[PDB]
Amino acid sequence: DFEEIPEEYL
Amino acid sequence: ADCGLRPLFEKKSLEDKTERELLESYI
Amino acid sequence: IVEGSDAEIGMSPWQVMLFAKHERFLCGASLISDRWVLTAAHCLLYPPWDKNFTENDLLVRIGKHSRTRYERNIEKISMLEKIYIHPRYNWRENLDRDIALMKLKKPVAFSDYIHPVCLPDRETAASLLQAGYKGRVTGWGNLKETGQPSVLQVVNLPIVERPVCKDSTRIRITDNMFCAYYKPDEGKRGDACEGDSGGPFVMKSPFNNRWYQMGIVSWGEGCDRDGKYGFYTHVFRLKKWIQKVID
């Protein structure tokens, strides 16, 4: 998995 | 700081499920 | 973690996940102040496997629980300003002095799930670092040697006498390491495993009730093997170096 993290953290 | 005192355990005087196993090993 | 159990919410609020910003789960680490993370040098610099990460390759994820889930309105993800590896980290033979500090770009805000662990003073190390006394290891590492948990795992383990540590392996042990784990005849078992590296080995002082980080998960030979022990970096022996870089 690994759910995506917001793009701000890049 | 206020290090090593957990907000949901030590700060409320609540114990986690297995910390007594550590304290019992200290002698 | 092998033969551990799910952590309770907020049980290890200093636990940090090292995450590649590319994503994969690189290692564990621990929160020691609002701007400094502690981890094993081998998580960042290991030439034999061509591993050499800089500040721009990584993210620190704090306040987690679930291993794969972004956890909003709970975790905090921070960028790194600078990495500092111990100058005498010996990756060529030993993993001697397996320690590194990571400075965050901005202070993290503490919460119910995010809070730092203390570092031991000489007296705390003297009273707690004794053969037989148990400490606790936490991490999202593999569950078996040869398989990944859904949530943060925890296991409590006894520190082993130095002669027993030395006789279980062919590797040269130094004064900057200690080993922990149950003996083959002890009934219980448990250990750190792949992915737990860099995380904290902590103990709770019976004197002032605070949690102290005594060790850093450093290396093992297999995971939970009979007659084998987990080896940890001795935080108190490297404390002057830590205080110097932080200043």
**Same-domain check for residues C110 and C146:** no
What CATH number has the domain bearing residue C55? 2.40.10.10
Contact between C62 and C31 under an 8 Å Cβ cutoff? The reply is yes
Beta bridge mates, C61: C17, C77
**Same-domain check for residues C28 and C101:** yes
Contact between C181 and C232 under an 8 Å Cβ cutoff? The reply is no
Of residues C173, C180, C126, the one with CA closest to residue C155: C180
* Opening angle at CA B8, ends B5 and B9, nearest 5: 60
Find the CB nearest A9 among C21, C68, C69: C21
CA count, 13 A, side-chain hemisphere, C25: 24
Element (H, E) at B9: none
**Same-domain check for residues C70 and C129:** no
**Same-domain check for residues C27 and C122:** no
Q: How far apart are CA C27 and CA C205, in angstroms?
A: 26
Q: Residue C200 has which token pair?
A: 């904290």
Task: For the domain covering B1-27, report its CATH number.
Answer: 4.10.140.10
**Same-domain check for residues C33 and C7:** no
Find the CB nearest C68 among A3, A6, A9: A3
Q: How far apart are CA C135 and CA C156, in angstroms?
A: 6
- Residues of C with catalytic roles: 42, 98, 197
Element (H, E) at B22: helix B19-25
Q: Residue C187 has which token pair?
A: 């009934």
Q: Which experimental approach was used here?
A: X-ray
Q: Count the neighbouring beta carbons within 10 Å of the beta carbon of residue C127.
A: 16
Helix/strand/coil for A1: coil
Contacts of A1 in chain C (CB under 8 A): 68
Q: How far apart are CA C218 and CA C213, in angstroms?
A: 14
Contacts of A10 in chain C (CB under 8 A): 21, 79
Residue type, C24: R
Q: How far apart are CA C16 and CA C26, in angstroms?
A: 11
CB-CB under 8 Å, C77 with A5: yes
Contacts of C204 in chain B (CB under 8 A): 19, 22-23
Of residues A2, A3, A6, B22, the one with CA closest to residue C210: B22
Number of domains in chain C: 2
Q: Count the neighbouring beta carbons within 10 Å of the beta carbon of residue C50.
A: 6
**Same-domain check for residues C231 and C109:** no
Element (H, E) at B23: helix B19-25
**Same-domain check for residues C179 and C211:** yes
CB-CB under 8 Å, A5 with C69: no
How would you write chain C as a 3-class SS string?
CECCEECCCCCCCCEEEEEECCCCEEEEEEECCCCEEEECHHHCEEHHHCEECCHHHEEEEECCCECCCCCCCCCEEEEEEEEEECCCCECCCCCECCCEEEEECCCCCCCCCCCCCECCCHHHHHHHCCCCCEEEEEECCCCCCCCCCCECEEEEEEECCHHHHHCCCCCCCCCCEEEECCCHHHCCCCECCCCCCCCEEEEECCCCCCEEEEEEEEECCCCCCCCCCEEEEECHHHHHHHHHHHC
CA count, 13 A, side-chain hemisphere, A3: 9
Resolution (A): 1.9
Q: How far apart are CA B10 and CA C156, in angstroms?
A: 18
Of residues C9, C228, C225, the one with CA closest to residue C138: C9
Domain enclosing residue C169, as ranges:
1-12+117-236
**Same-domain check for residues C102 and C164:** no
